[PDB]
Design an enzyme around this catalytic site. Structure first.
Site, mmCIF file in Angstrom:
data_model
loop_
_atom_site.group_PDB
_atom_site.id
_atom_site.type_symbol
_atom_site.label_atom_id
_atom_site.label_comp_id
_atom_site.label_asym_id
_atom_site.label_seq_id
_atom_site.Cartn_x
_atom_site.Cartn_y
_atom_site.Cartn_z
ATOM 1 N N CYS A 283 0.164 -14.866 14.043
ATOM 2 C CA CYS A 283 1.370 -13.735 13.630
ATOM 3 C C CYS A 283 1.123 -12.504 14.332
ATOM 4 C CB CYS A 283 1.444 -13.753 11.951
ATOM 5 S SG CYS A 283 1.904 -15.175 11.377
ATOM 6 N N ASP B 15 5.929 -11.290 6.732
ATOM 7 C CA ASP B 15 6.158 -11.625 5.309
ATOM 8 C C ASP B 15 6.097 -10.199 4.634
ATOM 9 O OD1 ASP B 15 6.181 -12.154 2.333
ATOM 10 O OD2 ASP B 15 4.916 -13.521 2.789
ATOM 11 N N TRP C 87 -7.157 -18.866 4.561
ATOM 12 C CA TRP C 87 -6.771 -19.958 5.660
ATOM 13 C C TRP C 87 -6.849 -21.265 5.090
ATOM 14 C CZ3 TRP C 87 -5.330 -19.331 10.909
ATOM 15 C CH2 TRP C 87 -5.457 -17.962 11.401
ATOM 16 N N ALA D 90 -2.258 22.552 -9.591
ATOM 17 C CA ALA D 90 -3.033 21.446 -8.681
ATOM 18 C C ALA D 90 -3.981 20.680 -9.679
ATOM 19 C CB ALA D 90 -3.776 22.278 -7.579
ATOM 20 N N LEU E 207 -7.703 20.824 -14.515
ATOM 21 C CA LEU E 207 -7.134 22.186 -14.025
ATOM 22 C C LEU E 207 -8.482 23.123 -13.761
ATOM 23 C CD1 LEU E 207 -4.226 23.099 -16.363
ATOM 24 C CD2 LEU E 207 -4.426 22.648 -14.040
ATOM 25 N N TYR F 185 -7.932 -16.839 16.357
ATOM 26 C CA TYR F 185 -8.036 -15.471 16.551
ATOM 27 C C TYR F 185 -9.507 -15.269 17.296
ATOM 28 C CZ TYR F 185 -3.987 -13.938 14.060
ATOM 29 O OH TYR F 185 -2.543 -13.874 13.617
ATOM 30 N N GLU G 93 -12.492 -11.711 6.611
ATOM 31 C CA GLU G 93 -11.871 -12.432 7.620
ATOM 32 C C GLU G 93 -11.756 -11.701 9.128
ATOM 33 O OE1 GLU G 93 -7.675 -11.871 7.489
ATOM 34 O OE2 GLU G 93 -7.059 -13.877 8.435
ATOM 35 N N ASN H 225 -1.823 -6.753 5.977
ATOM 36 C CA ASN H 225 -1.989 -6.816 7.474
ATOM 37 C C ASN H 225 -2.236 -5.246 7.794
ATOM 38 O OD1 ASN H 225 0.559 -9.314 7.917
ATOM 39 N ND2 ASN H 225 -1.653 -9.485 7.829
ATOM 40 N N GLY I 30 -14.841 28.228 -16.348
ATOM 41 C CA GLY I 30 -14.111 29.283 -16.088
ATOM 42 C C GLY I 30 -13.433 29.374 -14.555
ATOM 43 N N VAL I 31 -13.887 28.205 -13.591
ATOM 44 C CA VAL I 31 -13.314 28.299 -12.283
ATOM 45 C C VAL I 31 -12.783 27.022 -11.832
ATOM 46 C CG1 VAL I 31 -14.886 30.155 -11.302
ATOM 47 C CG2 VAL I 31 -15.799 27.824 -11.796
ATOM 48 N N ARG J 215 4.629 -10.934 15.246
ATOM 49 C CA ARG J 215 5.985 -11.753 15.449
ATOM 50 C C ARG J 215 6.579 -12.101 14.244
ATOM 51 N NH1 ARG J 215 5.267 -16.878 14.323
ATOM 52 N NH2 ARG J 215 2.954 -17.478 13.858
#
Ligand SMILES: NC(=O)C1=CN([C@@H]2O[C@H](COP(=O)(O)OP(=O)(O)OC[C@H]3O[C@@H](n4cnc5c(N)ncnc54)[C@H](OP(=O)(O)O)[C@@H]3O)[C@@H](O)[C@H]2O)C=CC1
Ligand SMILES: NC(=O)C1=CN([C@@H]2O[C@H](COP(=O)(O)OP(=O)(O)OC[C@H]3O[C@@H](n4cnc5c(N)ncnc54)[C@H](OP(=O)(O)O)[C@@H]3O)[C@@H](O)[C@H]2O)C=CC1
Ligand SMILES: CCc1nc(N)nc(N)c1Cc1cccc(-c2ccc(C(=O)O)cc2)c1
Ligand SMILES: CCc1nc(N)nc(N)c1Cc1cccc(-c2ccc(C(=O)O)cc2)c1
Ligand SMILES: O=c1ccn([C@H]2C[C@H](O)[C@@H](COP(=O)(O)O)O2)c(=O)[nH]1
Ligand SMILES: O=c1ccn([C@H]2C[C@H](O)[C@@H](COP(=O)(O)O)O2)c(=O)[nH]1
Lengths: 531, 528
Positions: A415, A438, A329, A13, A31, A355, A307, A446, A35-36, A435
């Site tokens: 859209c 792209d 726009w 990990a 890593l 909108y 926007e 979007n 030490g921990v 609807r």
């Protein structure tokens, strides 16, 4: 071949390390520290660790012990897994944990003796003494647990068959680092779902060393009428097709691109550009576990946040955006675009009742972008927030922008037709119906826009975001994005970022640009979709 | 205690139509095998293709295991082919240019003829036990019994069939030989295919059954990370191996909501299990997706759809056709509880029909003439499809935000979007709220018909109806009835015929629609 015989794998990990950044696989290499472990605790990775290092399939061991004996030119060997640690790694493990339960514990050290240890706790002096020890043991698989030196020399000798690599998508201080994996030698073959654990996202990837069947016949019969359509080549998506398990949620987007490329219908459109199109897709993103900002290319969010804020204010004045250098726009507000829309009597950059106007004033008569519309029309945005707070099992919490009466007065019809919201157990999900999609250029923005919007609605309603659900109607790839999307399909996603909102904002109209922060956005290089 | 049919992999394959004789339907509905010595139907080419693929397919890598198994049973140490077995009458019905069946070992059962009566490369055998002897001597992959009825009956009687590959021809023809009645205690359906159309009939394929390992582990690792409904309650549904019939799109969503749905109250107070976001796709070029696991009538929803298209909001018009779909939403009490105190009984307000033909006009009452008021979006989408087929703006929207509170109730079917490619028309409908038990079966039918009507008057063929579900819920009082329904096996779907003379969307009447070959299980009351 030794690693194939004895099934020697690495599991690790790694986090990101403190130093436009450049991201690649080596971005995740932290890593340990002092030490921990560099992080305090990430319990989902620990759950994954225990499941991987203890899982055994006895019904497959006979084949493995057969192969191991034949390699040694023996007939007998003389069920758990083997775990191999460096001494420093073994010391850091708390005494309560040691020895690792239900695992054959092997420490590669040069300053230890089995006389300080168990009979069942093995110690080896050099790497090749493990190959000896494994030949004498009964074990399913052998996992190398680290640390840095143990990883380094096991890897340099091609003793590792696969690398089980947790990508911890946060940055910590580290003084030991996983070795850089040479991509000629090892290649990623599987990528998992993205998760949140202990205030970080993470995912799990797999590196690989490079190089009743009665009902199985009935499968072929039911495929007897199947067709593989378009002039895209399979050999171009080599990395994409080579992956076995593609569970990362970004593959919801990438699989749709691949589907449209492989099976889309060739069609014209207004700009004469040409598209490949299909009809009807759903994508679902779990906002509780990640923020689905595409990582296989670079995405910028300032424009689409402004926007969104401009929408919530109810604005239709394009100049407001343009003065902030938000140009989403601009082409839709020019004299020529409006004239071609027959909006001869519309001021430049007056987009009409789009909108923002429909969200706050649906049904009011539009005059011009400067008029005062306070208390005119239906304030849908306020209504849906109140429905969410006061009637959360309502099936009528919809925000609709497709005002049929006003469409022709709009610079262009929306859209994003509607959002519908769903509340269960204090959690908010949102469906957006689009609807026209792209895929190469518009859809990535979007997904971010409405994912952010879902967080904003949830927060001002004292809910947690659950799912953003994206319904694609006419879904198209522009022919002039095909080369770029081929490049993108062969990039492997990184673990997603997260979104942080200013927690003090308790009203939908009170967000400003500075209340939004994207954290740990790890991404591939930006791509011009039109090359 | 081995079984001959399992050692030697003996299967039966057949195709059955319905036979001429307020009706009940069961598996024995499909039993027509032949007529006047030949097949009852002219030619159903898709079944021929399926027949070929099954009876010629061999997996070479599997033969090693097959040879060992047969050798064990018998106590012993060119391209691989299947064996096919025909009765003599069946053999003689096949046209000569197709005999012997290409790439198969042909075996004819006869007593009145012997090998000297045949020019062709075939084995003659005069009793069933000589087939078993023959199979012990041949190299073959699988052995398929092709009929006819006599051959089927005795092979079934002797329990020599491991699986029946059974084509359901969903049309009626005159027949004089019949497939034996399958004993349900002996054979059960384990898989069902997609539905298809071929030569003006629908059909499906069902199967009866006698009653790098490295990547294996990586799957387990990636899986390292709810409702009081019981397993035994879905024995039939979960015993099925392959569930490819399109009705399983609907049944699987029911199952998904039952097993994973969220427990919620609702507006009615009944209580539901609910989920959020589903999509079904139905191929109208191949079938009409009228549910078969329960009985449905379409006269009401067709009158409703025609009433929509006329722009009507007058509920009395439906009730005078004895169509009661909207009656409860028209009552004085219902209208009052909607605060529609100044609304006449059964005046539903500006609902679907008004929005389709007059969006944005001010609603007055159900009797007004709204001619040339508001946006006629129905005419508009028809014009866009005809003249601008690649438009991404071909949308019909009933959710008029301004008018919602004047509606008897807000629409569930928010929008229709259309899609044209290669002379074929697809339709997406988005449903905000979906009563899976009662409303969704009807809603699928309504918009499937609407797609045919729009395609025809635009000179297109229907392709896909696509149904997007938003809030998808199962009412608690439907659960027991739906448990019954999920354990029924769909029948091949029917077909929908429109009068082809109808060229304008407004000119349809109830008699221009025909549902043909609806085979269905018994009617279910969803409640109680
Ligand atoms: N997050 C993760 O996935 C992991 C994190 N870690 C972190 O890494 C750090 C420890 O890694 P590191 O510091 O590299 O120490 P190691 O874990 O590599 O163990 C080092 C010890 O292994 C022995 N050793 C190394 N090479 C050989 C060899 N060729 N032959 C014989 N014995 C050998 C030596 O013991 P002697 O001194 O007797 O020679 C040396 O002291 C810790 O901070 C730990 O938390 C560790 C493993 C995985
Ligand atoms: N739709 C479909 O899936 C199918 C349709 N069909 C239709 O079925 C009809 C023919 O079926 P059917 O009339 O039942 O006749 P069959 O095809 O069943 O064959 C009957 C004849 O086969 C021989 N035979 C059968 N069993 C034995 C036995 N155990 N030992 C020796 N000889 C045996 C005898 O031939 P002899 O009299 O010479 O001894 C008997 O008269 C035709 O209409 C055909 O088109 C046929 C197959 C499948
Ligand atoms: C993040 C760990 C890890 N994850 C992955 N995927 N691969 C790894 N090789 C490691 C390192 C490792 C190996 C063995 C034990 C422990 C451990 C013990 C005890 C404790 C504790 O007491 O908290 C923590 C870790 C770690
Ligand atoms: C309907 C086929 C069929 N389908 C299924 N699923 N199982 C069957 N056992 C049959 C019967 C069968 C077998 C072989 C040939 C013919 C045949 C060919 C050509 C003609 C002709 O050209 O007239 C007639 C019959 C039929
Ligand atoms: O937010 C947006 C806005 C536009 N588009 C794309 C879809 C189409 O490619 C084009 C809009 O043109 P029409 O579909 O309206 O013709 O822009 C999007 O994907 N997302
Ligand atoms: O055509 C219809 C009309 C109604 N319903 C169901 C969905 C809900 O169970 C109920 C309407 O309730 P609301 O969502 O409007 O509250 O009726 C349908 O499934 N289809």
């Amino acid at each position: 071949q030794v690693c194939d015989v004895f099934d020697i794998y690495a599991i690790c990990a790694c986090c990101k390390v403190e130093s436009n950044e450049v991201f690649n696989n080596y971005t995740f290499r932290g890593l340990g520290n002092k030490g921990v472990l560099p992080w305090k605790c990430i319990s989902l990775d620990m759950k994954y660790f225990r499941a991987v290092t203890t899982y055994v399939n006895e019904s497959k061991y006979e084949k493995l012990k057969y192969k191991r004996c034949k390699y040694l030119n023996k007939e007998t060997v003389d069920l758990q897994n083997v775990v191999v640690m460096g001494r420093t790694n073994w010391e850091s493990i708390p005494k309560k944990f040691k020895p690792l339960s239900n695992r054959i514990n092997v420490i590669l050290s040069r300053t230890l003796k089995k006389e300080d240890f168990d009979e069942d706790v093995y110690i080896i002096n050099k790497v090749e003494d493990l190959i000896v020890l494994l030949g004498k043991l009964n074990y399913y698989k052998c996992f190398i647990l680290g640390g840095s030196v143990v990883y380094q020399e096991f890897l340099e000798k091609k003793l590792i068959k696969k690398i089980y690599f947790t990508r911890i998508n946060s940055t910590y201080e580290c003084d030991v680092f996983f070795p850089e994996i040479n991509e000629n030698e090892y290649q990623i073959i599987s990528v998992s779902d993205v998760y949140t654990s202990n205030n970080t996202t993470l995912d799990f990837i797999i590196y690989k060393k490079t190089n009743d069947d009665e009902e199985e016949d009935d499968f072929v019969y039911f495929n007897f009428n199947k067709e593989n359509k378009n002039s895209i080549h399979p050999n171009d998506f080599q990395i994409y097709n080579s992956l076995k398990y593609k569970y990362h949620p970004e593959y919801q987007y990438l699989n749709i691109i691949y589907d449209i490329m492989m099976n889309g219908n060739k069609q014209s459109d207004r700009t004469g550009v040409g598209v490949l199109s299909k009809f009807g897709y759903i994508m679902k993103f779990d906002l509780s576990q990640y923020f689905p900002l595409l990582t296989t290319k670079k995405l910028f969010l300032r424009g689409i946040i402004e926007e969104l804020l401009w929408f919530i204010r109810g604005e239709t004045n394009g100049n407001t955006l343009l003065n902030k250098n938000v140009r989403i726009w601009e082409a839709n507000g020019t004299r020529e675009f409006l004239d071609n829309r027959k909006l001869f009597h519309r001021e430049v950059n007056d987009l009409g009742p789009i909108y923002g106007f429909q969200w706050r004033h649906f049904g009011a008569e539009y005059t011009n972008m400067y008029d005062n519309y306070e208390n005119k029309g239906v304030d849908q945005l306020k209504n849906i927030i109140n429905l969410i707070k006061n009637d959360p099992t309502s099936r009528r919490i919809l925000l609709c922008a497709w005002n049929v009466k006003d469409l022709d007065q709009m610079a262009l019809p929306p859209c994003h037709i509607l959002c519908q919201f769903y509340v269960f157990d204090g959690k908010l999900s949102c469906i957006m119906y689009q609807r026209s999609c792209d895929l190469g250029l518009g859809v990535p923005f979007n997904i971010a826009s409405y994912s952010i919007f879902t967080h904003m609605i949830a927060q001002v309603c004292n809910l947690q975001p659950a799912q953003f659900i994206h319904v694609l109607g006419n879904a198209h790839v522009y022919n002039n994005h095909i080369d770029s999307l081929k490049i993108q399909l062969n990039r492997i996603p990184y673990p997603f970022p997260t979104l942080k909102l200013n927690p003090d904002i308790k009203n939908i109209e009170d967000f400003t640009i500075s209340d939004f922060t994207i954290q740990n956005y790890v991404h591939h290089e930006k791509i011009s979709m039109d090359m």
